[PDB]
Amino acid sequence: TYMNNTEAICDAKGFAPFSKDNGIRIGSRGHIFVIREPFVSCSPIECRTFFLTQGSLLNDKHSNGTVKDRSPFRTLMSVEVGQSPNVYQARFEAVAWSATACHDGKKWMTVGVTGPDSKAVAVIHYGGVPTDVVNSWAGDILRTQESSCTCIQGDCYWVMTDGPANRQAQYRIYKANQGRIIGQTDISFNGGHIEECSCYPNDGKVECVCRDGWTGTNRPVLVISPDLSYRVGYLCAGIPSDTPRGEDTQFTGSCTSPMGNQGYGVKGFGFRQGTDVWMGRTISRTSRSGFEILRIKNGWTQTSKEQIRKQVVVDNLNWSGYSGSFTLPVELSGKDCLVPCFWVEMIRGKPEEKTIWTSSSSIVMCGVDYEVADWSWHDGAILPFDI
């Protein structure tokens, strides 16, 4: 039966560790898929860690130039949380070099984009087989979330971007019901930019903290309603949460336009706490090192820079990376509110390291009503590997 994800997100004063795969460390001797862009999405029975394999393993020659991003070998596969992305416990999702996934209370929906940049196709699967399709609509890398999509009473929604990664682009919202696409929307956001969004459900509306790859050091937000009516802009808070980013001191927040004179970024997330917001970010304002998450007061609605809580999960002496949001189905947590959880991708190898390869590890963190102590659950692998 369908999963009602109508409830509001729970209010947490801190997050507790869910799991840690140790994929790379383990990957030093075991048969682990060299991957990247990992993420967690739960069904009403278990959570699984979805990844993107480079079509190869670690400590193997085929692990070589796996820094290339897109290729025909990458395929979306999944395993139960905590388990490393290994071959023998791996479940095949879809052929993809960019994917997204979500359960709805019955079957798993997956969407894997692959093919040429100028004509890539996004194949949606439902129950272990493709049901519908989307063709690149703007001939420039049809890419999607790299994060869990959202299902609310049988209808799962997600966001996609087609255009250049730098300047302006075209963003759309897709809505489905059993693998089948049932309507979509064009997002008007000129001057703005949306990439690899992180969503979660909160009151029958889908909230996403995306990635402005153009002119944004402050991340963009977008609330989606069940009838494609939407709302978009940037997370207000007078604090930037992208990387590379400028300092907090010299940064004025903006609920409306992008702020900062930086032009890149990394995938991140953020949760709406009433008006307050929990925002993840790399300790380093420049590199992809360390991961932290702060709660700015009234930061979801005001240019606030007033924090009441902070907590680190990866110190600045350890490689960080991507971050995503999802929720613990009420049918698992037992709460009467959607427990807010998130993950951190820990990339190892090129470019910041001397190795023929590039992969990443992850760790999962969930809500909690208590405040959880700063610490580091970093990758741990000793590079370089045997090669």
Place this chain on the structure above:
Amino acid sequence: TYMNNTEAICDAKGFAPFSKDNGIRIGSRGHIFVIREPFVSCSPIECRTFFLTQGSLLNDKHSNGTVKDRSPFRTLMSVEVGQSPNVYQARFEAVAWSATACHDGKKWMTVGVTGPDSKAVAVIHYGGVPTDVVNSWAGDILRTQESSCTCIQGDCYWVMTDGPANRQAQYRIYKANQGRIIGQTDISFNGGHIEECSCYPNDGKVECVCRDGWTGTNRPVLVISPDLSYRVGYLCAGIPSDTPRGEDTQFTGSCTSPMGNQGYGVKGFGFRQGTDVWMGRTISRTSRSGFEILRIKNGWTQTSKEQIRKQVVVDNLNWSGYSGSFTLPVELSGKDCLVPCFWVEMIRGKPEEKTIWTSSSSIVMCGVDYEVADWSWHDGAILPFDI
């Protein structure tokens, strides 16, 4: 309960990628079964990739002369689609150096042929254990489909060939109901030739595009009815779809007799689109390189050479191979028509390559109502291996 595969095949304007195992690439460091003659068949809950192991793994000495075709070590085993043919996730089917499989809505039926060429036996299994048997009837390699067989309301049908691979032979159609053989038919087709057929269900009749290994560059077709009454000949279309094959320019199609002065071939498939036909074929008219699929107008009934669609899945600079047909049970796809899907075997190693071994990789492609862009999802392994 039994699966009604009475519906007609759906009409597609193009195919979308289902999966890609990367068995060989992965096989460079992992424990993957050196195999060949792979194929996909679905049950009303999942699709599995059936293969033929050489009784050994990759990057191992026992991978040696695995180019030999038949031996006592080869056994039919299966894994969920997309997953590579690995040992730890492998399910044992039957002892075979030539097999076929199909689900019927309850249990899986498998038929594995093995033993000596002059007296090989085809052991049929049902539910994880052999139920009936067939003895070679013409003492010359009792071989079968290497493709998914067809079940329509409790009765699964398939085709077999006993005789020389070159000149004339003896073809038969077998019909069963729960592992148990319930009647059969002799196919009169003198001058004609049938090998490794590819079937699928379309309107309660079983359609197969087989392989003329004698004098056919154009492939043979055969519509089987539920009471063994059948119909046979070649796919009409003024275009040859076998390899080796002559050019299209100098080829007149023939709904009746084989055409072309070539005497070999490879396993292929084809779908009946109304009167139109989707036909797969290697880009190369000579070697086993590249894979493509065209839709010739009215090509199922007329000597047509009028195509309205084309699409590549493996460019001519990459190894191709076998191709097969199957369908997505309505109980998975949710359609009201049997979604047409197919796979491409990508052989690597001897003979076209310098390696002690020979194996292959596969990729799955399904129906779709939209037109899907040309591209290549080729093997990817870097040969030779460590040996």
Place this chain on the structure above:
Amino acid sequence: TYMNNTEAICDAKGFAPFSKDNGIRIGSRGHIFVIREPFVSCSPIECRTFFLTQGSLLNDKHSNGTVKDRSPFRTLMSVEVGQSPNVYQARFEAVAWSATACHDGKKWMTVGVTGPDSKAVAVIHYGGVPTDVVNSWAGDILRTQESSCTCIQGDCYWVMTDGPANRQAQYRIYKANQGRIIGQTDISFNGGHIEECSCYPNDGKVECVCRDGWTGTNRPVLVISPDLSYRVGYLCAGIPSDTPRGEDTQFTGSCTSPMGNQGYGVKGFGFRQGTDVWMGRTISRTSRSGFEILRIKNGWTQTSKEQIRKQVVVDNLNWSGYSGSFTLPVELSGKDCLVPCFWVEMIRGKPEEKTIWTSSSSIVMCGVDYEVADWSWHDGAILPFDI
């Protein structure tokens, strides 16, 4: 619900291959348990291959003196038929250097004997945990079947031997009902000898063809009734079916006493066909090479040497070994008679080979109403290994 194994065995004119694991070949590169004394037993949903691990894998230093027979490392584990005895797909049964197993229509019963020779204990498990126990009763290696035990309407029976492997000994029959021992019997058979029996169900009575290790070249039989009343002696037939054995020419059969002047043997089996008997045996009368099975007319009741069928499964140029009997539950085969099946252990390494290790492979063969052609599905591994 309980499985009625009251029916008679089906009458076969030949056997067809069920499976072949290729454990050793595969074991050359994969992680396979170095084992020995393998056997198959089925439940009403699947058959599994039970083995005895040496507590180590192949191509490893811990594979060393694994020719030793008994040790504290050996444990009974199982995997679905056909699958090799690998670690990652392995199910733990019991701690044993001698075991037996059987399902009853609900849960799996296993009995693993281990410990010191003068006080070994046989731990019986039911449903994945030990329920009852048996202590050595004659202080000289408490050993059992190494073959599937028999369950008939909730009560599973098996046989055990305590005494010297050479001269006289003490044999007993054990009967249980849900892991719990419910009565037993002492077998009076002075001058006779019983070891590693092979049983199967036939008309609510348990038939076993055991192994006379004392003075028997002709094997012993014993029909057990549901109330421990039994019947014992040797398989009549004027043909010996043990190894080492004397020729057939100079051998007079004996339904009563052991025959032949040989003092060793190997584990074998035999089926009661009306009055006729199917008897397995190594082609070689001296070494453990090749496996064959003949059907002597009226050989279950008369000193017959009149065969009507023969069939080889492993030619005399390939290593053979142990053989066992079991049946395909009616709830799998669908018959109205218990399909007779058997397996052949193919031992490789010491003593007949130059390797630090010793293990074995198996192959499964089942009933069938047709006659199946001679052939060889031998091990296949290339020794010696990397060591």
Place this chain on the structure above:
Amino acid sequence: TYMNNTEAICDAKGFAPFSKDNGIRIGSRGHIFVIREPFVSCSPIECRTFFLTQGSLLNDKHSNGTVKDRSPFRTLMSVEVGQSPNVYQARFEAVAWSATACHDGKKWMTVGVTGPDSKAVAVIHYGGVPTDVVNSWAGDILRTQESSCTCIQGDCYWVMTDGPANRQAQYRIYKANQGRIIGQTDISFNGGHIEECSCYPNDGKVECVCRDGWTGTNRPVLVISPDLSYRVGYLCAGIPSDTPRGEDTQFTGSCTSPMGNQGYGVKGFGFRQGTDVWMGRTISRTSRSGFEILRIKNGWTQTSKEQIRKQVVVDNLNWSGYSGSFTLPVELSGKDCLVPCFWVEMIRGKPEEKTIWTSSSSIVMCGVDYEVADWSWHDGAILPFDI
């Protein structure tokens, strides 16, 4: 439905082997998690072996200083009993360098402590996801049982220690009901010490034989009632069961205070047999070698030193280690009394051995009404490894 663990423990005259994983031996060539602090806990369908991985495998460089105890890589994972702690059959529990687990008749509850010593957090999970949390309450290594916790009619209880491992500390009892903490207790035991308790259910009250790391050679006991009212002290018996420990001759038992002038220890267990007690202990009074278990008459209530039974499981020429208690749910054993079972950790490597690494193997032993013969089912690995 909830599991009533109200019954009394069964009365055994000896224990029989349940399983043996051979993790290390196997770990010489296979992909086994280098671990430590293993333990068994059963649900009403199966028992699983829970462990603590060092976030790495064996025969790998990441196996290095795994003697360190606490780190961010260690995570609690589990596998079915007998199976080794391998990657491909491993189930992820929680992020922990100190854990405890128990089923309640529906879902599995796990509690993994991790993080910094001065602020570690104990994350409790229920059904495959964290439900509640506990923060270090005395800033000095928040650690727990390393043994199965106890559930009685929906409420699972366990014990934790926060303070120095040497002198005085703070002990607490936690009670939950579906991952959610429902009340707790402070244990007054000045001069006393409690660490890594071993509990089991006996008459609706939780009995634990813990570890006095301060001044105890005799172990402490504590009976917990369903309303947090408790009872504490040391196991009476005039025999010490800790290591290091003084001799039995010069040791007077004490139901009240710690006895002996030793200041360390190892994790152990003990069962209440009426008034009698089964107590496990290392043969060696000094090192962690050999494992034995005795039954002292009236030793649960009197300073007794009168034994009626003894039995060894690991001779003094083989490495021993940790020991724990649990029970076989009535829904598995079928008894009308909770069968008493236990396990022995067999540590190999540093410190007692010359290897870069440190791990351990285990073996499981259960109740039984018969007396079981002394023997040794020691590790078996040949060190040092390939490194």
